Amino acid sequence: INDNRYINGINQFYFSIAEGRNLTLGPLLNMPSFIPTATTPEGCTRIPSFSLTKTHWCYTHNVILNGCQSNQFVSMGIIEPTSAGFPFFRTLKTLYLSDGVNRKSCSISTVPGGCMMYCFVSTQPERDDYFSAAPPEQRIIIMYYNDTIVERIINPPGVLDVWATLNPGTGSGVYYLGWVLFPIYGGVIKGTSLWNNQANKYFIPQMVAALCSQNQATQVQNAKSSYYSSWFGNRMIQSGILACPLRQDLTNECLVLPFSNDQVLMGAEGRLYMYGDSVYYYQRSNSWWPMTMLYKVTITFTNGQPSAISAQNVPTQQVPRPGTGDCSATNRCPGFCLTGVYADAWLLTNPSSTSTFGSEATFTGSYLNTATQRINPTMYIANNTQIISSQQFGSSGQEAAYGHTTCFRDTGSVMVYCIYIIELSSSLLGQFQIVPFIRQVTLS
């Protein structure tokens, strides 16, 4: 179990609104990395997922032997203090799922006594998945600290003949009230109930108006069209949550809960968080709006089962991501787009602490500082409109990809540490080196 110094400093808003204004990033600190490196120049390690809870943490990433176009590495352990005062992620178990099953886009989550991981089995190019009317096989693997492993092929209702494809968001899932929730996304088939119930719905971030040159009627029209991709088999690209009861005999008990397209952007990879008793969702900006999308999620239970989800966006115009064409970091107008990168963000302040939800919110993470290239990885702290602290890693031109950020407090020294897991392009070993950067978020 995690050291006494951390058990009470996990999954919470660490600073008050007032303190958020005076936060700065400290130096990067050196700890033994718990994320394995490739041993060949061409080896590819990508798509990390990290979940940290009161008792322990779970980590996983995909490994491809030659180039990035597989096996899945899983790790679990605890956090303990070093003589220098900062954390050391102590690995207590390692697993390497290598058996011919092409598990991809995996999301992992901590569960009592272990880790639960959700993946889909890839057997063809992603685009092909959207055209085929049949969805890929879905699997959830439970790995207990006692070395028992139980993998199950799941068939949640409302998937067959509704979703042409379904993928985990790769971002971490969370254990909530006895259920394990994972972010999901995919393409929905035209004419289905889901498609019809979503017809004419769209979402436009609160701060777009002041930045978009188009008029309200034009924005609305374009936003509605941003949820359908002709390139991806003419499907409605949908975001949602997969709720699975913690059981070892899962078959069709997991539930697919899509977000209303009136509250969320075009479906994309994502991540789920827990701040106190509240669930939050991060949605990759793979559509027209290039800014960090975070939402407070309200989950409704009907007869002990998740029945519906509602999302409330934390309005911002900060931390853009690189994109292609008319959907770069400089875009501000609605339209159909299918480009971007995963770059989640951690809320250091409570958005509900303000009279108007998210009026003044502070968050931290990493982002690729450039308009269209996956370059210049930069760790930062920002509020709704400005970056109040940042530090680029490496020299300009340094290639990078996804970034997963997680923060926690050591209740002993009373300092907050954040880990920024970044896929870095390496010239020595492997295509990428996934690095768990760690530093302190200093108040002052």
Ligand X SMILES: *[C@H]1O[C@H](CO)[C@@H](O)[C@H](O)[C@H]1NC(C)=O
Ligand Y SMILES: *[C@@H]1O[C@H](CO)[C@@H](O[C@@H]2O[C@H](CO)[C@@H](O)[C@H](O)[C@H]2NC(C)=O)[C@H](O)[C@H]1NC(C)=O
Residue 129 site contact among Ca ion, ligand X, ligand Y, none (CB < 5 to 8 Å, cut-off depends on kind): Ca ion
Instruction: Kindly state the smallest distance separating residue 443's Cβ from ligand X, in Å.
Output: 6
What 3 state SS string does the chain have? CCCCCCCCCCCCCCECHHHHCCEEEEEECCCCCCCCCCCCCCCEEEEEEEEECCCCEEEEEEEECCCCCCEEEEEEEEEEECCCCCEEEEEEEEEEECCCCCEEEEEEEEECCEEEEEEEECCCCHHHHHHCCCCCEEEEEEEECCCCEEEEEECCCCCCCCEEEEEECECCCEEECCEEEEEEEEEECCCCHHHHHHCCCCCCCCCCCCCCCCCHHHHHHHHHHCCEECCCCCEEEEEEEEEEECCCCCCCCCEEEECCCCCCCCCCCEEEEEECCEEEEEECCCCCCCECEEEEEEEEECCCCEEEEEEEECCCCCCECCCCHHHCCCCCCCCCCCCCCCECEEECECHHHCCCCCCCCEEEEEEECCCCCCECEEEEEEECCCEEEEEECCCCCCEEEEEEEEEEEECCCCEEEEEEEEEEECCCCCCEEEEEEEEEEEEC
Residues 138-167 that bind ligand Y (CB under 6 A): 144, 146, 148
399 binds, among ligand X, Ca ion, ligand Y, none (CB under 5 to 8 A by kind): none
Does residue number 357 form part of the binding site for ligand Y (CB under 6 A)? no
- Could you tell me which stretch among 18-26, 182-190, 375-383, 390-398 binds ligand X (CB under 6 A)? 18-26
**Residue 22 makes contact with ligand X by CB under 6 A:** yes
Chain residues 141-200 in contact with Ca ion, contact rule CB under 5 A: 164-165
Instruction: Provide, rounded to whole angstroms, the least separation between the CB of residue 179 and a copy of itself.
Output: 18
Per-residue CA distances from 227 to 171, 238, 280, 372 (Å): 21, 7, 22, 22
Contact status: 19 vs ligand X (CB under 6 A):
yes
Looking at beta carbons only, is 94 or 330 nearer to a copy of itself? 94
- The site for ligand Y, by CB under 6 A, has a size of 10
The smaller minimum CB distance to ligand X, of residues 317 and 364, is found at: 364
Phi, psi angle pair for 50, to nearest 5°: -140, 130
Footprint of a copy of itself (CB under 8 A): 3-9, 27-40, 42-43, 45, 63, 65-66, 71, 73, 77, 80, 82-85, 88, 90-96, 98-102, 121, 123, 394, 410-414, 424, 426-430, 433, 435-438
* Closest among 331, 353, 332, 419 to 10, alpha carbons compared: 419
Interface residue with ligand X, options 1, 18, 65, 308 (CB under 6 A): 18
For ligand Y, the closer CB: 188 or 388: 388
**In whole angstroms, how close is the CB of 19 to ligand X at the nearest point?**
5
Residue numbers 172-211 binding ligand X by CB under 6 A: none
Which one of a copy of itself, ligand X, Ca ion, none is in contact with 165 (Cβ closer than 5 to 8 A by kind)?
A: Ca ion
The option from Ca ion, ligand Y, ligand X, none interacting with 384 (CB < 5 to 8 A, set by class) reads: ligand Y
Rounded Cα gap, residues 321 and 241, in angstroms: 23
Residue 46 CA to residue 243 CA, distance in Å, equals 25
Smallest distance from Ca ion to CB 122, Å: 11
Q: Which does 257 bind (CB under 5 to 8 A by kind): ligand Y, ligand X, Ca ion, none?
A: none
Nearer to Ca ion, 164 or 212 (CB): 164
CB neighbourhood size of 100 (10 A): 5
The one segment of 14-22, 96-104, 159-167, 299-307 that binds ligand X by CB under 6 A: 14-22
Rounded to whole angstroms, how far apart are CA atoms 441 and 256?
36
Residues 371-390 that bind ligand Y (CB under 6 A): 383-386, 388
Q: Least distance to ligand X from the beta carbon of 287, Å?
A: 36
Residue 360 sits in the site that holds ligand X (CB under 6 A): no
Contacted by 7, from ligand X, ligand Y, a copy of itself, none: CB < 5 to 8 Å by type: a copy of itself
Least separation in angstroms between residue 14's CB and ligand X is 13
**Does 349 contact ligand Y by CB under 6 A?**
no
In degrees rounded to 5, what are phi and psi of residue 206?
Answer: -45, -30
Q: Does 245 bind ligand Y (CB under 6 A)?
A: no
Question: Which of 21, 152 has the CB closer to ligand X?
Answer: 21
CA distances from 334 to 118, 214, 216, 325, 330 (A): 32, 9, 10, 14, 12
Residues 299-318 binding ligand X (CB under 6 A) are: none
164 binds, among ligand Y, ligand X, Ca ion, none (CB under 5 to 8 A by kind): Ca ion
Residues that bind ligand X (CB under 6 A): 18-19, 22
Residues that bind Ca ion (CB under 5 A): 129, 132, 164-165
Residues that bind ligand Y (CB under 6 A): 113, 144, 146, 148, 360, 383-386, 388
